[PDB]
């Protein structure tokens, strides 16, 4: 999805194996805020929110708590008290074409900053001046959603990067997204410490 209309997928009622993601070498950024990757495979959470979008290379830094930019203020805003992981990888192979891939759009102007975990898909003309815009794109009135240009020959700071942000929350409801518990081989006829289903 585009960063203005980032897809949110709720992951529930399954076992989340986080070691598959962490041990992959295909990801440039695997920055976890509020939790460490080593203990993710053990902890259990009520739901997992997977927010997916495409941004530029230079804009990956703005997907963090406390940051400032076009993406943070007008496209995707993260709370300061955020627990989760931001995973980003280069997508020059898929999201760039020789003519230019303009299918990805970003919100360039908004009257106020976005709230955390807010999606704005409005297509109303931005009013930058006192004059009434009146629906027409003229002087001091601009379209808020601007297309992105993706070429395979661009620099590393302008190449498309796919970002998936996983948000971990705990609610009063029983936590169902748990990490894989594992298992050793069973040994019989000896005095051992057994842990069977807790």
């Amino acid at each position: 999805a585009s960063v203005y209309a980032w897809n949110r997928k709720r992951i529930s009622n399954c076992v989340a194996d986080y070691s598959v993601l962490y041990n992959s070498a295909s990801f440039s950024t695997f920055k976890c805020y509020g939790v460490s990757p080593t203990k993710l495979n053990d902890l259990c959470f009520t739901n997992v929110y997977a927010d997916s979008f495409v941004i530029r290379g230079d804009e990956v830094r703005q997907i963090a708590p406390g940051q400032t930019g076009k993406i943070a203020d007008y496209n995707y805003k993260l709370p300061d008290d955020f627990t989760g992981c931001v995973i980003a990888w280069n997508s020059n192979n898929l999201d760039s074409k020789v003519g230019g891939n303009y299918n990805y759009r970003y919100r360039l102007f908004r009257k106020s900053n976005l709230k955390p975990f807010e999606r704005d898909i409005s297509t109303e003309i931005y009013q930058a001046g006192s004059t009434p815009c009146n629906g027409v794109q003229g002087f001091n009135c601009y379209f808020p959603l601007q297309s992105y240009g993706f070429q395979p020959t661009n620099g590393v700071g302008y190449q498309p990067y796919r970002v998936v942000v996983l948000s971990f929350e705990l609610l009063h409801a029983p936590a169902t997204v748990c990490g894989p518990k594992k298992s050793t081989n069973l040994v019989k006829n000896k005095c051992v410490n057994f842990n069977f289903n807790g």
Binding site: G129, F139, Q146, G149, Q151, G155
Partner: protein
């Protein structure tokens, strides 16, 4: 709400929709340059037309925001850059006439072929047919024939065209609130609104004269030595008391004196520092040359080249089947795409050129963080100067020994340093009076100091007074002698070389002082010094955001251009030339004593 917020949003809208269009135009231009095909020419023309129309519409929208209600320096600078009318303020008929005049001058200069009367079956073009004759011949009448014939044809064709050109450019400049076209060119160095760092358009001419007055003794001694050597080469033509003949300076126009190194060598018997054979023996490819240049830039602390640079650049000649422009050019295509187009050979000149162009690439990379309309040098001099300092540092014997191209037991005595410094003087110092005289003459023509009927009588008088070069035969007003040069005929500023030359040695002194070099300035290498690279990168990162005076304060600690680093660079040579000129007479006479 406020005017400042409106301008900031408009500038963001401009930079966003202008970076992609500039990238498309630049990519089409690159595809044309590496692949000269008719469809590529059409694509380049279409992209250029789209870019120009978009810039016209954005400028038209930009003018609606008054400058006086904006207090932010960067926003005001971008709005000032965008709001320039250019030729748009002029009427459509006159604008079309000016464009037609520029195009026809380009065709006349580019496709000008001149050969000897009575043998017209084939003729030689300027490049490389006449360049080789000017640079290598030792015959007086052949060089005189080539010089006079080319100025006869080109000047007689271009004189009415130049007369129309000056009037149209002055009309456009006065319509744009400037005194003349010279003021329009001098407006590049204008700084307004900064406390203490302000620079005026009128101050530039005074500073150029003040520096040139100190340039003049060194140039007089160099001219006397070159005059004595040319007198040795040509026994009767050159006079001891007069100026040098115009057609004997080694180039078509007198722009550089670098082709007289063979004739004017101090110590011919002693060797040079040529490293071509060493690279040929060790099979150094062009890729190795660029890797060594990259190693030099990482040595001083600057960032290394991108992956896109190595993948997308053309560093070897493609072949007979595919045609490309051979001129080395660094391309900042936009969106972080930096490339070098050079047909690199295994020569010292290509190696120094590779360092110069990679310096251009480093300068382009440094200001990538800045807004799109401020992604340029602070002035026209700095952009070339940052490449020229790399060219200076790479050519030193210490660098060649460090990188393995020179033998570690090579003896660096005073004679090699003297002859190398004389060659550098012929290339660098020699262009300064010609540049200053040409720019001053053009400024007086635009200002109206010189009437149209007295253009050439003053011009030769200037050339005798400043350059110390006399005309072979008198020229009347049917000739247009200045317009035979590439820069003036195609509407290009010429003071960039003078500013680049002074800034080059100012930067060299600043970096060498940063690197704690304790010897002569010409023997200094800026490799392995992190602090020098950091001091350079502080200015490099600014781009066009800050005034050039503040940038010069950042590097050298001075608020104005200075002439002392150049004189310090050539001080051993200056003392040697003063010692060698005891018998001869320093200085020249403006009279017709040698020949007229």
């Amino acid at each position: 709400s406020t005017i400042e917020e409106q301008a900031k949003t408009f500038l963001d809208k401009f930079n966003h929709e202008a970076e992609d269009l500039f990238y498309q135009s630049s990519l089409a231009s690159w595809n044309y340059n590496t692949n000269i095909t008719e469809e590529n020419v059409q694509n380049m023309n279409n992209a250029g037309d789209k870019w120009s129309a978009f810039l016209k519409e954005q400028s038209t929208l930009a003018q609606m925001y008054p400058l006086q209600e904006i207090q932010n320096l960067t926003v005001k600078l971008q709005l000032q850059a965008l709001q320039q009318n250019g030729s748009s303020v002029l009427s459509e008929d006159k604008s079309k006439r000016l464009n037609t005049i520029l195009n026809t001058m380009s065709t006349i200069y580019s496709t000008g072929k001149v050969c000897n009367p009575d043998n017209p079956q084939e003729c030689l073009l300027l490049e490389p047919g006449l360049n080789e004759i000017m640079a290598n011949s030792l015959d007086y009448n052949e060089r005189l024939w080539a010089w006079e014939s080319w100025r006869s044809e080109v000047g007689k064709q271009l004189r009415p065209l130049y007369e129309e050109y000056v009037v149209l450019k002055n009309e456009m400049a006065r319509a744009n609130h400037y005194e003349d076209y010279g003021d329009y060119w001098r407006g590049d160095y204008e700084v307004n609104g900064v406390d203490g760092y302000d620079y005026s358009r009128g101050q530039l001419i005074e500073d150029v004269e003040h520096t040139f007055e100190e340039i003049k003794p060194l140039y007089e001694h160099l001219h006397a030595y070159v005059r004595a050597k040319l007198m040795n080469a040509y026994p009767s033509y050159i006079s001891p008391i007069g100026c040098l003949p115009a057609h004997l300076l080694g180039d078509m126009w007198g722009r550089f004196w670098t082709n007289l190194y063979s004739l004017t060598v101090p110590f011919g018997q002693k060797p040079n520092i040529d490293v071509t054979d060493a690279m040929v023996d060790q099979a150094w490819d062009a890729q190795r040359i660029f890797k060594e240049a990259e190693k030099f830039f990482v040595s001083v602390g600057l960032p290394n080249m991108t992956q896109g640079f190595w993948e997308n650049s053309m560093l070897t000649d493609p072949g007979n089947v595919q045609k490309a422009v051979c001129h080395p050019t660094a391309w900042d295509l936009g969106k972080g795409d930096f490339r070098i187009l050079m047909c690199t050979k295994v020569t010292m000149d290509d190696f120094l050129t590779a360092h110069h162009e990679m310096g251009h690439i480093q300068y382009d990379m440094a200001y990538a963080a800045q807004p799109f309309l401020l992604r340029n040098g602070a002035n026209e001099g700095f952009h070339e100067a940052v490449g020229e300092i790399m060219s200076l540092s790479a050519a030193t014997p210490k660098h060649l020994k460090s990188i393995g191209l020179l033998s570690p037991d090579f003896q660096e005595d005073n004679e090699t340093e003297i002859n190398f410094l004389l060659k550098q003087a012929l290339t660098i110092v020699g262009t300064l009076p010609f540049t200053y005289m040409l720019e001053k003459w053009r400024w007086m023509v635009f200002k109206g100091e010189i009437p149209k009927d007295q253009w050439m009588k003053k011009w030769w008088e200037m050339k005798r007074e400043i350059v110390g070069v006399v005309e072979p035969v008198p020229h009347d007003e049917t000739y247009c002698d200045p317009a035979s040069l590439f820069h003036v005929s195609n509407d290009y500023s010429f003071i960039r070389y003078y500013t680049r030359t002074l800034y080059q040695f100012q930067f060299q002194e600043a970096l060498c002082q940063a690197a704690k070099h304790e010897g002569p300035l010409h023997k200094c290498d800026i490799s392995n010094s992190t602090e020098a690279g950091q001091k350079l990168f502080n200015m490099l990162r600014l781009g066009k955001s800050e005034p050039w005076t503040l940038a010069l304060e950042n590097v050298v600690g001075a608020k104005n251009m200075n002439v002392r680093p150049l004189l310090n660079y050539f001080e051993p040579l200056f003392t040697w030339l003063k010692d060698q000129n005891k018998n001869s007479f320093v200085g020249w006479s403006t009279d017709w004593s040698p020949y007229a």
